[PDB]
Each structure stands twice: as C-alpha cells, then as structure tokens.
Design a binder for this molecule. Structure first.
Ligand SMILES: [Cl-]
Ligand SMILES: [N]
Ligand SMILES: [N]
Lengths: 388, 6, 388, 6
C-alpha cells in the first residue's frame, strides 16, 4: 500500500520544519539526507536521523492509504515552507510522491526507504521537568560550555540526577555554570551522571519544547546512561542524542565557600557599561573593574586604539579590589542570571569570582568581611584575567 | 586569561 | 587652537553613522579610515572620503574652541551609537580626543590631519528631484545593473537629464530597466547624461537622505558631466560620487514598439507562484510560462530533483504562447514594479518581454493585435531563456 | 539564456 493522506498545511509545515533542523547537510550516506514519512491510524510520523541526533514528530492526518516513503528533506522543507494555506494532499505513486496544495503541484522522486537506517529506540523515561524551567536552566548553563569541536570534552553539559534533584553544569576551563533544579522522577530513584552535547541540548530546549512538560530518557535503575543515548520527549516531538564519553571536571571544589569582598549592582546597568567600555578593548581583551567605596570604576583600552572608563554606583562591602575579566565571558554570565541585580563574590584578583542573582540577605551584609557564600540555585564562576 | 582546570 | 565642542547626541551619532558608511572595513591608505571633525562658528562638519565617494554633513555645535581633528571612523561610529542620551562633550588635547557623555569617558588617539586628502568640491547644481521619487527610481533600475567589473559598461546606472524629465537606466545585457521621472532643472533645455556606479548610487538611495527634495550637481548647461563626479545636496548633507568613464550601451533600440501577445496578472500572485515552482529547478536557470485561454501554466524541475507546476488566472490577449525566463530575473523585475498588477508584452518566445505596471488601458485590451507598446514610467525588459 | 545585446 502506497501512502495516501491529507494534512493541514501549518501542521505538516511546522513538523517538517522542526524535523528538518536536525537533518545533516550533505551527509556521507545519501539516505540520511531524506525525511521519512509514515502514515497510519489517523496520523503521520515525520522522522529524520543522522546517527548522532534523531528527530521524530507525529501529527494528525486523514489517512486514505497507510504507507511509508522517504523524500529529500531539504527540498521537502523548502516546498512545505512556501505552500498556500490550503490542505496538503500527499500521495505516493510508484517511484514519485505527489504533493498537492491549492493550485500548486509537486512531484518528487522517492528515495531508497530500504536503505534508510532504523531510528534508535529511546531508553526508559527517567523523569519529567517543566518545559519552561528546563529551557531556562539549560539556557543558563549552556553559555559556559565550550564551543570548539577540537576540544570535545568541553562541549558538553553535565547532567546529574539524584532523586528529585537535577544538577546541570558546563565549563570551558575559563568559566563554569551550574544550575540546580527539581524534577518529577518517573522511575525508582536514580543517582547517575551523564554528559550531553550542549548544542543539541540547548537546541532541544529552544525548538523541542512544544508542550508544558518535558520527559527525559536515560534508562532505569543501574542502566541509567548505559545506552549512551539521551531521549527527550514532549507533546508530540521526541528526539535522541548520543552522549559524550568524557569526564567532567570536579567543580564543587572550585565553588568558594567564603568571599573576602562582595559587590551588588544592577544587571542592565553593568551590562550596558561593560559593552560600552569594551568598544576599545583589543578584541575582548579585558575589562578592568576597580571596586572602592561603593563605586565601580570600569576601564579598558590601549593608547593606540583608545581607552574608555565609566563609573557606576555599587553596593560594595569588603576590602577594595581591582580585578579584570573578559568582557564577553562577563556579559555571558550576567545574561544568564535572569535577575534584576547581580552579586559578585570575589577573593583575590587571581582567583575565580562568583556571579549570582542578588538575594535579600545581601542587602543586609555589610562589614569588613569575610562573608559566607549564599545558597543559590544558579551560579556562574568566572576566572579573572591577569593584570600587568 | 587564567583557567579553572587543565 | 584645539577643537572643543558640545553636541546633541542624536545629531552627532546620526551624522557619524551616515558619514561612516563609506569607510572601508580594511583601509588600504591609512588616513582614509578616519572621520574629519572640523568645528567653527557654532557648527561641526563631519567628513569622510575614499577618493571615490565623499560624504560631508554639518550639524549644530556649541563651539568652545574652533579646531579640526581626524579620528577613527569605525570606532567613533560604534562609540557614538553606544553613548547615553546626553550632551556629548568633545575636547581635543594634544595627540588624543576626549569624548565625554554622561558617565562614559572615552579617549581616542588622533590621526594625521595634515595627511588627510581634501574633499572634492561639489559641482554646480543642475536641478532638483523629490528625494523619495529619486530613491525609488534608483532602486527600481538598480535591480538590472550588472556586477562583473570585467564588463564595466554594465556596472553603472545611466542618468539622463533632458529639461524637466530625468531618465535612469541600467542593464546587464540580459535585462534592461529604464525609469523616467519628472524633476526640476535650473537651466531648461539641458540635454546631458552621465554614468554613475550602480552599487554606490543604489546604497546611497537605500540609506536615504533627509529632505523632501534632493539637489543634483552634475554641472551647468554644456558643462554637465564634465566635472567628473555627481554631487548630491540634501538638508544638511552634501556628497560626491566619482562617475564611470565607460560608455553606456545603446538601449532605446531594444524596447519593442508593439506586442503580438499581452498578459495582465497580479504581481503578488505571480511572484508567489514563481517562487514556489522554482524550488524544484535546482538549476535555477529556467521557469516555463504557458499562456493560453486566460490561464498561465507555470512549470519547472528535473526528474532527479522534482517537477513542479501551477496554474494561475490571467488576462491574456493574443495567440497561445510558451516562453521561459530565469526565475531570479523575473522576480527581480516583478519586485521593482511597485504596482498591484503587472502587464507583459511578448513577441516571440526568443525575443524580449516587457514587464511594466498595469494601466487602465490594459483592461480594454481586446482583439488579436498587434498591440502598440504603451508609454510607461518604468519598464523592465527581460530576455527569455531558449527552449529545446 | 539569450542576451538583449552584447
Ligand atoms: Cl564535582
Ligand atoms: N583540564
Ligand atoms: N557584446
């Protein structure tokens, strides 16, 4: 039986659009360039796969003849993206697929569905997270992951599961992001850790969270992470991603427990100022932060390109300090706090600083120090830059 | 630029 | 004396942004990367120059001390766009320029002002044109200008002035755009013509020029075009553009005088259809148009990629016709008409086709022709694709 | 592709 079915334009176009993002560009095996359509029992299944990441979504469908077909993914995406808002009639006829919408008519050559690899079966679903919380946490941590495939061991997000607690981490050796959150476990309690490619996980957080809840699949019991695969399911969309076989550093030990100095200031203000003074820095060379008497003196630049400085009111408690940072790394941290005010926790100009959201307890603390580190769900440790 | 780990 | 001046942020930032468009991102001649700030008599002049296009703008200024200084244009632009909305104090002191605004304090290095080339003097004004009309016309014609500098005669927009009527024209051998428009000369009976670099003129039009009217300065009477540059004066701005020594082709002989067939159709509908059908033409070199019985049948594709076709209603007068065009050239022309309905004037499937805005007279088209070629303000003559 | 001129 050849596939004959009618679908809604927006449904088919959205599904194809999403499944098409995971498609490989000019893959080794030609069939990998195709999208798989399988219609049955008043539904259509649209799938893509590249041996590293898989995307599968199911949409409503008026089935006239259940069947399966494989068509060029990018071409299907371009076509579906330009169809008029009318029903989409899909009908496989021999070696070609007939796609009809409005007065437009397309006839494409099918692909070798037999040569197409079987999709990976997702492990057992371990737990479920609110979609917005998951998206925020991942977005907050991923900024700290490495972005260089020549250093793959840095390009991951560590996912720790301990009962109802989940800890996400990421680093590139110069900055560390950690987010603690709670989820609803769907299996007996687990105590496992894996390393997921950050780009794929963030992609799933942005484009994969179609619903309000997000189920994650890593296994069950002792076989959590054994399959080397992570499943991510939502309302209709389910994807898979290969795990990274690399060790994540020990980060709990680098998180300071006390701070000699502390500086609270507004995120928007600080961000704008950093981006302004950084205009004269030598390609994100460094920004100099001079804290003293509740005033933050920002400066940067050389005498050959130019130098800039700007003063900002700041709630600074502790010993005066002069510490420098990479502008991009700094604004990356500030942009992940998602709070009105940021609180820095400095030690020495040559040791990490703790950017974290401001808490009510910080307005209170004021003295000579030392000050104890506050408990916070998200933390962004940033290594400073050596000054001349 | 210093590093957190190696 | 060293320049000391206060300025309004928006005035200064806008002037700098407009003057800094021309500067190269990688300058060959050093000084040609700098912006010239010349202050005096409650005014500030901001200049750029690259031996081809000169841009000069004068803004109001609170001059505390007159002077001139050369600074980096790209850096000054990025700084001025990032400044707070507060008065901008500019004080040149020795080898540096202090730019203060709000809490931001910038200090840039100066450049060799003595080694900065003088700007070309704008020729004598030849007339005036409504700014928006001039810009629209430049864009309407620019679509057809060639971009291969090995064929310089095709890389420019021809500007003819004949009394109160200006004609713009461009062509890349495969297409010919011609746009007539009414302007206001200062010396009637002027019959002149120049060739302007298309990319320069088109970009200047796209950016725009504040003011209801723009004054062109090509010369005076017989001296028009002999100065070697096109001057343009708007409210507060004056610019020069080096002309092209090449000779524009003879194009008036190419415009058909009559048509054996006619087709009037909606621009939006046709544009969508062509964009759709052209997806399966990965060659991107041909879309097939079949006119017959008030039905336009579009088709394209290849059995290795896909075959697409689509029917549209059309007001077609004359005998059936089958003619193919390059989809890019076709949509480029349809995109320049700026009208709701387009009218085609075909002869043979191997001879040019006239694309122009539809007129009321075209609704009266009846009979088997021939049909006299109507006079139109914009014409886009497209050469067809040979079919086997 | 034909040419209007050349
Ligand atoms: Cl750890
Ligand atoms: N490391
Ligand atoms: N030619």
């Amino acid at each position: 039986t050849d596939l004959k079915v009618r679908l809604v334009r927006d449904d088919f176009a959205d599904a194809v659009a999403w499944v098409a993002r995971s498609l490989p560009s000019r893959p080794t095996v030609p069939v990998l360039a195709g999208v798989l359509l399988t219609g049955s029992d008043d539904g259509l299944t649209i799938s893509s796969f590249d041996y590293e990441v898989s995307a599968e979504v199911q949409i409503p469908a008026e089935i006239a003849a259940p069947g399966t077909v494989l068509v060029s993914g990018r071409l299907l995406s371009e076509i579906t993206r330009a169809l008029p808002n009318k029903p989409v009639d899909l009908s496989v006829e021999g070696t070609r697929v007939s796609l009809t919408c409005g007065s437009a008519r397309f006839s494409l050559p099918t692909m070798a569905v037999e040569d197409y690899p079987a999709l990976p079966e997702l492990p057992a679903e371990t737990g479920s997270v609110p979609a917005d919380l998951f998206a925020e946490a991942i977005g907050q941590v991923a900024v700290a992951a490495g972005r260089d495939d020549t250093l793959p061991m840095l390009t991951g997000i560590r996912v720790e599961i301990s009962g109802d607690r989940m800890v996400l981490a990421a680093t590139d050796r110069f900055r560390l992001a950690v987010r603690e959150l709670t989820w609803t476990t769907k299996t007996p309690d687990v105590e496992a850790a894996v390393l997921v490619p950050a780009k794929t996980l963030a992609e799933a957080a942005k484009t994969g969270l179609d619903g309000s809840e997000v189920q994650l699949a890593l296994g069950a019991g002792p076989s959590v992470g054994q399959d080397g695969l992570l499943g991510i399911r939502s309302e209709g969309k389910r994807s898979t991603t290969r795990l990274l076989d690399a060790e994540f550093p020990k980060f709990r030990q680098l998180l300071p427990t006390e701070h000699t100095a502390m500086a609270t200031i507004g995120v928007g203000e600080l961000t704008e100022a950093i981006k302004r003074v950084a205009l004269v820095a030598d390609r994100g060379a460094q920004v100099r932060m001079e804290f003293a008497d509740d005033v933050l003196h920002l400066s940067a630049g050389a005498d050959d390109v130019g130098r800039a400085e700007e003063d900002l009111p700041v709630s600074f408690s502790g010993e005066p300090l002069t510490i420098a940072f990479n502008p991009g790394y700094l604004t990356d941290g500030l942009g992940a706090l998602h709070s009105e005010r940021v609180t820095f926790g400095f030690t020495t100009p040559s040791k990490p600083a703790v950017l974290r959201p401001a808490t009510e307890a910080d307005a209170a603390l004021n003295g000579n120090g030392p000050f104890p580190a506050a408990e916070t769900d998200y933390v962004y440790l940033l290594m400073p830059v050596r000054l001349p | 630029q210093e590093s957190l780990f190696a």
